[PDB]
């Protein structure tokens, strides 16, 4: 009659037996790989225990947010540039989280061993948590922050700009569209193990340096969950390492997965960190070179060579693009600021020094251009100037990579300025590298994403913004801005007066 | 030779250790209470140790009483063999018959000095505390401020040593 | 370092002053309500809605979407990340659904965690109170360990039937509900195992191995048709809505409700078993919680859709007919379990009454919502034929 | 404003700078463990002990105290704020006690709150699942509403018996346990009323008024002796330990355990009542939780005190004899409730078996701890005497 | 068949009847007042709902503490003076909360109406929560603070100093010793209502100004609970307003209650605030006046006028002896700094200016004295000087009021200077005011608390400190200090070398 209970491991010991056999007990999804039904999961959890450990984390998190942080006015005492950056970081990561939900549900369907299914199940629930957490950061900054617009409607205003498209590729479609094993790699073996996990941490660092204690509170909590997903990351490479097919499909999918993620995040995360912050933490270049090398492409991927795993053949090229890509990109993001749901700022004097010191030649290229744009009045509404005009004037067309959706200006870029233009069955396609090009050439039907120029062609700028609700509550002022100050904010009319009319750059080709 | 451990306390400990009978120990306890407790104590010589000493003395009395008394007696008889209920009702009677607050405080205080457990069983004692206390306050708190300090000092019978008042 | 090396913008004097200096006098927009553009289901917008609605990046070509354009990367062959093609049902807006309980992740794990911790406290008191003594041995070693134990594979199978929906659901509100419906089912299956593992600790000789109950499920007669329906609902349905609807509005509303409530919940007490009813209390709470969500999605939203009401009812009506037969068969085979019970436990009249209860509830709660013409007598009659 | 007018020392640059400048390079003492001087009951000191032990300002003249001197203000007459004179029991240290569950305020309300919220969810599922249908009307309207309802006043009375202890307890660890023991009892009484109020909502014509159950308690025959014992334990005992010990280690361990577990818990199921057992699950969890604390204080600490072990056992042995009688009477009068039951509900053999269970548990858990020579047969015989 | 439940309000509709009348259904405690058994409570709660609303508060509180606040290093970035002050404030309030537990348990016993008993029950559980909360503040500052000593053992080290004795009087013995109605007033009608509450808020203010975010997080939570005890405060004046005795006893216990409370807190609180802080919030003189007038002695008491309640007849006296009370006390506290369990600092330049600005005349008296002590090396361990010596050398005897236990020095005080000495049955007694004198003359047996000079008479300072564990971990350095810097801390030896032997000041009248 002595007090006794039963814990999760005592129940989990019999979970592998839960699944039984029958003719149609198989995956509903197409996949070149076969997952062994003997696979086990690293953590012995049951719904009840999972819920409890997650609830305990919520208590602390929301307790800090609703109480002490609110009392300290943490939602306000953040640098303006960072308040804006978090609109993009949080919401873009939100969709990565959301899509990871569907993707792991697909992995759950693929797994045949009850334990491997259970591991993924935990992740399905974690990615929902994460969706809701990223949503909460925006929700919180909108409720208590210095500028709610963008934070309060990113889910619809994110659709105006080009940066958003590439996000759906690496953290949405790249997560759920394709072979489950290909999606598994885009999400876990590369997306998280190479970018997300080290990224989540980095964000908390850049956030703390800029007065943001809200993001660290939530993201540090997200990291604890992702720890399990990491350990669950090898589980997918172990349940196929035996199947003969794996020894001839694995590397290819892993290569694309890697290029897909890198192509977008390399230039975008770095852009948000260096140009979206006041206080710097560490040059993206050495932050990257660490992640991809001293943390992934070696001290992480080398622990799997015993399964036929090799090195990303595009790893060399990718490297030659983490130095300048993000710089090439802010040029374009600022140039097209009226299309975002956030306010951007020109590099100040102190920042230009930092940039030039950490990236020699930055000034003679980007610096001089930024100085010119300000001379043109890019920050002042009455100037009648938008950097986009400068690209037209100086004949520097902007293309969108049909695959990655990454905007690029081959004539001005310092990264992979290798433009390739093809015509196929009555349509023009533009690529920025040899990798994305092979992808489209082999899998045409997987990449038909129409770009902003194709969709906006012949439309007047002001009309697109108004149509896609890119305005503040006064119904007149633009959410996006070319500076982060409190006055002299551009209005819809300021943009209309410019009479900017999009055109599809590829149409000049005969 | 400090606050919690000193020669005086050691002395009483040894003294207490040589109390092999209930009658002796009980009588010593009551004598101790008359000598060292309440504002009416016969002396203030043990002011810094009496509270602790008394407790140690109560300990012996309780242990002896438990071994000497049968169940019914342990519940209803005092350490002196007196019927607890009688003493209680008797003392309450005198209290209600108290003419003033001065006679009352003498009744209550003495009651505590003579019957505080382990002499009287706790149940009767606290029942007593309940009734005696109620009466005492009623008498004391009636026109609490009418009598001026000058006279109250005399009523208490204190020896004014020094006074200052600018 | 007591202080530390990392200088934080909120507390570092130098940095904080720079920050404070760059701040605007007042917020740059007084609209501090995230999700203000969402149409509230109730009086005022809820945290549940704000944090959930529109998280799914659907473009306008998928009913209710706010984005535009095709997906950036699709499946080999061309299949869209999400598309109308994954379900027969049609609507004017896939974001109309609302979980009546307004459960987003935080509230969900909070409630389940409270349940988990209470369960632990319960079992510890139960065993310490030695209540196990008054429980019938036959019922314990035969019906609880074997037949109740076997049922876990039924709930486990229903759980797995949600896998495709987690991937295909066309909106956040639906995906989240779907996820919680399935998670609750795996929870129940695990709770059934938790009870067997508990008995094994306070009852010497009690085997917590699933071998027996599994064998009963895979090769028994009592659950044969049940397993056949489960196997189909899970692996033969590729339509995420048909699966969810058929599982919760047909099979589990009939077979599940009968087994859980009309058999074990109803008879356990008669054998001095208050242990099992403790867990069924959960499964029933969970069933009733999912029912509200199921009703809102398939009836309030799809079944009453302003433009596809008639169409959707036809489909669900079709689905109900498709799965009602296998469900009746599952119930029929289950009738055989009564012959195993000790004589006098219950009679054919009670059985019939309990059947009519499940069916009558089903007709009022589900069948009537889509105008499915159900015949209570005929359904009950078909099932009773199973009484050995 | 947006920044507010109040400047805070943690975030204000100017103020924070002054503060940082005045800080020492490192802490002025590396002993960062509050309560380091407390003797741990377990391997390492617990948060429970740190936050509780020695909160009570007792001076050394009250066993285990760390302070010195008399109280600053006492009662009229001279009675000390707290004193040895408030209990017959003696110990070497009143701070030795430890609640095995290590409950300080936070953990306590957290567990009960989880229970409260689950209870709500349960009742909502129960009613929606229409489980009330299968419940016997006679049992519902007569035994649950009247006899179970009347029991609430028994638990309420036991609750009130703790009042003096809340005031007189000679230590924090004991005061806190006492408080939680009593609070759990008022909770149970309120839960009994919650069930009656629940039935009143889902059962037309059910009166939630306490008039009936109260009348049964105040003037009935079934609980007459029970009420008489309760009235005494509460208002005739001025010794905070005799009250706590006699209530939990005698009366409630016998009468309470029988009524709760051997009558309603055991029979409710037989009448299709799973509602009541849900609440008794709590009362039983609470009883088992308090038992661990009760045992630690009266047996581990007082009953086995290095210097007063023999003395204290004599007293508790005395107390056990004093209250074992009124308790037997309470049980005896309670036997009459069996006659009011429908024929065949239960027989004299089951009654006797359930009695032996309560007594045997009582002897194993309490009576034997103080060497109280109990005769199971004689006790059972006596209670069985006034059997219906 | 719809989903329904039952809430606390509905069950509490029948709690009033739970109690049944019978033979000895009466209070076990002595009291001049009779509480009507028809009394109702303001809040309709049951154990379950009480627990829930309290748990929700805990979540936020502990969440903030364990998470964000810990990450911000909030336990450290507090001014040294305040870190010390909180050792006293938190632990002293801890005992007030702890005795409030026993006191309300006594009130619970007194009440005859089930609802009035229930109201007190909620409070019994609340005070327990407050005990544990105050304990947590010390626990937290000990675990994460700049100086754990004092925070880590106040429960035993508080017994060395004289300030602690008066604390047990107003918030311990004054709470449980005496007529339940007298104790009720000491706790709720005067203690909580006049001081405790407005005090809790004030503490959070002074704490925030000095970098302490830990105390606000906890104390603000305690206040929410107290907002309920307030409403329950009139419940005690309503259940007796009818009884004839009340119209003849209430005002007296209330007057004594008021005086008792203010006798201690008027000086101590002002002292702790003004001298235990670096940054100021508001001159205590103006705080006290508002609390004890426009608030308590005015608004709060005036409403009870319809129950007979009259303003304390000692209200005029209290305000008279108040202006300089706290300043007068600090001289004493500092002079006897070795008897504490916290470090004290002398007013710096800005502070003296602040004090003079706010209390004209302050400098010529207190200011000059502190500069004198400082110049003579009172902060230096090699000076061989502690201010106690200055009092002996300048013939300024320090007495302890036999009633309130408050230390006072008539020959030096700028405030009250009245002193009354009597001899009764072999024992001398010192008093500081006409009210305490009366209390003793009438209730000699209620006041026999021995003072530090009596218990320490003949003992050498360093020995008393050693015996009572007034040391830090190194077993040599004193917990108490005459300054708050990190270097040149005083040791036991430094004290022993002073050769200070305590004397019972009263004997100078033999
Ligand atoms: Ca052409
Ligand atoms: Ca068959
Ligand atoms: Ca029949
Ligand atoms: Ca029909
Ligand atoms: Mn994630
Ligand atoms: Mn993940
Ligand atoms: Mn309080
Ligand atoms: Mn209070």
Curated annotation (Swiss-Prot), chains A, E:
Q: Which residues bind Fe cation 1?
A: 97, 127, 130
Q: Which cofactor does it need?
A: Fe cation
Supply the Gene3D superfamilies for this chain: Ribonucleotide Reductase, subunit A
Q: Locate the residues binding Fe cation 2.
A: 192, 226, 229
What EC class does the entry list? Answer: oxidoreductase
Q: One Pfam family of this protein, by short name?
A: Phenol_Hydrox
GO biological process annotations for this chain's record? one-carbon metabolic process
Q: Which residues form the signal peptide?
A: none
Q: InterPro entries recorded for this chain?
A: Ferritin-like_SF, Phenol_Hydrox, RNR-like
Q: Which reaction is this enzyme known to catalyze? A: methane + NADH + O2 + H(+) = methanol + NAD(+) + H2O; methane + NADPH + O2 + H(+) = methanol + NADP(+) + H2O
Residues in the active site? 134
Cite the EC number: 1.14.13.25
Q: Which UniProt keywords apply?
A: Iron, Metal-binding, Monooxygenase, NADP, One-carbon metabolism, Oxidoreductase
| Top-rank taxon, per record | Bacteria
Q: How is the cofactor bound?
A: Binds 2 iron ions.
The GO terms this record gives for MF are: metal ion binding; methane monooxygenase [NAD(P)H] activity
Describe the protein's quaternary organization and the partners it interacts with. Answer: M.capsulatus has two forms of methane monooxygenase, a soluble and a membrane-bound type. The soluble type consists of four components (A to D): protein A, comprising three chains, in an alpha-2, beta-2, gamma-2 configuration, is a nonheme iron protein containing an unusual mu-hydroxo bridge structure at its active site and interacts with both oxygen and methane.
What is its biological role?
Responsible for the initial oxygenation of methane to methanol in methanotrophs. It also catalyzes the monohydroxylation of a variety of unactivated alkenes, alicyclic, aromatic and heterocyclic compounds.
User: Family per UniProt?
Assistant: Belongs to the TmoA/XamoA family.
Name of the protein in its database record: Methane monooxygenase component A alpha chain
UniProtKB/Swiss-Prot annotation, chain B:
What InterPro entries does the database record attribute to this sequence?
Me_mOase_g, Me_mOase_g_dom1, Me_mOase_g_dom2, Me_mOase_sf_g, MethMoxGammaMmoZ
Disulfide bonds, paired cysteine numbers: none
Superkingdom is: Bacteria
Point out the signal peptide segment: none
Checking Pfam families in the record gives:
MeMO_Hyd_G
Q: Name one GO molecular function term.
A: methane monooxygenase [NAD(P)H] activity
EC annotation from Swiss-Prot or TrEMBL: 1.14.13.25
* GO process annotations (BP): methane metabolic process; one-carbon metabolic process
Q: Which UniProt keywords apply?
A: Monooxygenase, NADP, One-carbon metabolism, Oxidoreductase
Reaction it catalyzes:
methane + NADH + O2 + H(+) = methanol + NAD(+) + H2O; methane + NADPH + O2 + H(+) = methanol + NADP(+) + H2O
> What is its biological role?
Responsible for the initial oxygenation of methane to methanol in methanotrophs. It also catalyzes the monohydroxylation of a variety of unactivated alkenes, alicyclic, aromatic and heterocyclic compounds.
Q: How does it assemble?
A: M.capsulatus has two forms of methane monooxygenase, a soluble and a membrane-bound type. The soluble type consists of four components (A to D): protein A, comprising three chains, in an alpha-2, beta-2, gamma-2 configuration, is a nonheme iron protein containing an unusual mu-hydroxo bridge structure at its active site and interacts with both oxygen and methane.
Against NCBIfam families, the record matches this protein to: MethMoxGammaMmoZ
**UniProt name for this protein:** Methane monooxygenase component A gamma chain
Give the source species.
Methylococcus capsulatus (strain ATCC 33009 / NCIMB 11132 / Bath)
Q: Which gene encodes it?
A: mmoZ
Swiss-Prot record, chains C, D:
One Pfam family recorded for the sequence: Phenol_Hydrox
Q: Name the keywords, alphabetized.
A: Monooxygenase, NADP, One-carbon metabolism, Oxidoreductase
Q: SUPFAM superfamilies per the record?
A: Ferritin-like
Task: Give the molecular function GO annotations.
Answer: methane monooxygenase [NAD(P)H] activity
Q: What is its EC number?
A: 1.14.13.25
Task: Report the catalytic activity.
Answer: methane + NADH + O2 + H(+) = methanol + NAD(+) + H2O; methane + NADPH + O2 + H(+) = methanol + NADP(+) + H2O
Q: What class of enzyme is it?
A: oxidoreductase
Q: What does the UniProt function comment say about this protein? A: Responsible for the initial oxygenation of methane to methanol in methanotrophs. It also catalyzes the monohydroxylation of a variety of unactivated alkenes, alicyclic, aromatic and heterocyclic compounds.
Biological process, per Gene Ontology = one-carbon metabolic process
> What InterPro entries does this protein map onto?
Ferritin-like_SF (IPR009078), MethMoxA_beta (IPR054956), MP_mOase_hydro (IPR012078), Phenol_Hydrox (IPR003430), RNR-like (IPR012348)
Q: Which CDD domains match?
A: AAMH_B
Q: What is this protein called?
A: Methane monooxygenase component A beta chain
**Is Lyase given among the entry's keywords?**
no
